């Protein structure tokens, strides 16, 4: 315990934390108006960010 200063856990994303990765990652694509990423974020049951 005198060695490591702080240990930080990384959880898998929830339905909130998948939507923003869809937001940032969906930036460089030529989309179509009206997408509803909330539904797709629910369709993915939280694997990881990759």
């Amino acid at each position: 315990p005198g060695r490591i200063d702080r240990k930080i856990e990384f959880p898998p994303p929830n339905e909130e934390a998948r939507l923003d990765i869809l937001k940032i990652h969906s930036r460089k694509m030529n989309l179509t108006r009206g997408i509803n990423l909330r539904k797709i974020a629910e369709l993915m049951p939280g694997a990881s960010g990759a």
């Binding site: 030529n30 989309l31 179509t32 108006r33």
Partner: protein, 194 residues
């Protein structure tokens, strides 16, 4: 260039500044109807479902587009006076509302008039738009304005057209830009070196 930046109308969004998507649709059709010719109009705006379903809620704009495409010339001046009137009372188009319809009139006159050669002047009042003296002074100031390629006869009551080449008209703007840039580099040429 304005319709060319207004090309997509698909990736365009329910905006903060055009909160009506359909106002953006009216803008892109009002600029498209000058900005592009028939081939483009006869494929792009006439077959777009994404552009069709939004003027599907428009009674006048769907009419105002189809009065021009479907050769409904007489009501086209009525709806033209409507859209020109609102355009006169519109921000950002009130700088050029007179510029708009002076191109719309000569555009429709080019459309009907570049079909036949021996069509008479009295034919157009009942099928095109009323006022024989109006068509008289109106085409007279456009041939006199050096566009609208035809040559009207008067005291036998017939309108004759021709076809010019792409030579002297294309020559004209070249001598315009040549004299303009000659003025530019002449003026700057006196600016530098005292």
């Amino acid at each position: 260039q304005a319709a060319e930046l207004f090309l997509d109308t698909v990736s365009t969004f329910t905006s903060y500044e055009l909160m009506d998507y359909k106002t953006f649709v009216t803008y892109t059709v009002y600029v498209s109807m000058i900005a592009l010719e028939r081939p483009d109009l006869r494929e792009k705006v006439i077959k777009g479902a994404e552009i069709l379903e939004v003027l599907h809620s428009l009674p006048a704009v769907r009419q105002y587009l189809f009065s021009l495409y479907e050769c409904r010339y007489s009501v086209f001046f009525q709806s033209l006076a409507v859209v020109e009137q609102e355009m006169k009372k519109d921000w950002l188009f009130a700088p050029h509302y007179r510029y708009y319809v002076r191109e719309m009139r000569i555009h429709a006159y080019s459309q009907l008039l570049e079909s036949y050669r021996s069509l008479t002047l009295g034919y157009m009042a009942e099928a095109f738009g009323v006022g024989v003296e109006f068509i008289d002074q109106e085409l007279s100031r456009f041939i006199a304005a050096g566009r609208l390629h035809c040559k009207i006869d008067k005291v036998n009551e017939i309108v004759e057209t021709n076809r010019p080449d792409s030579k002297n008209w294309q020559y004209q703007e070249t001598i315009k830009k040549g004299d303009l840039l000659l003025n530019r580099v002449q003026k700057l040429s006196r600016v530098i070196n005292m």
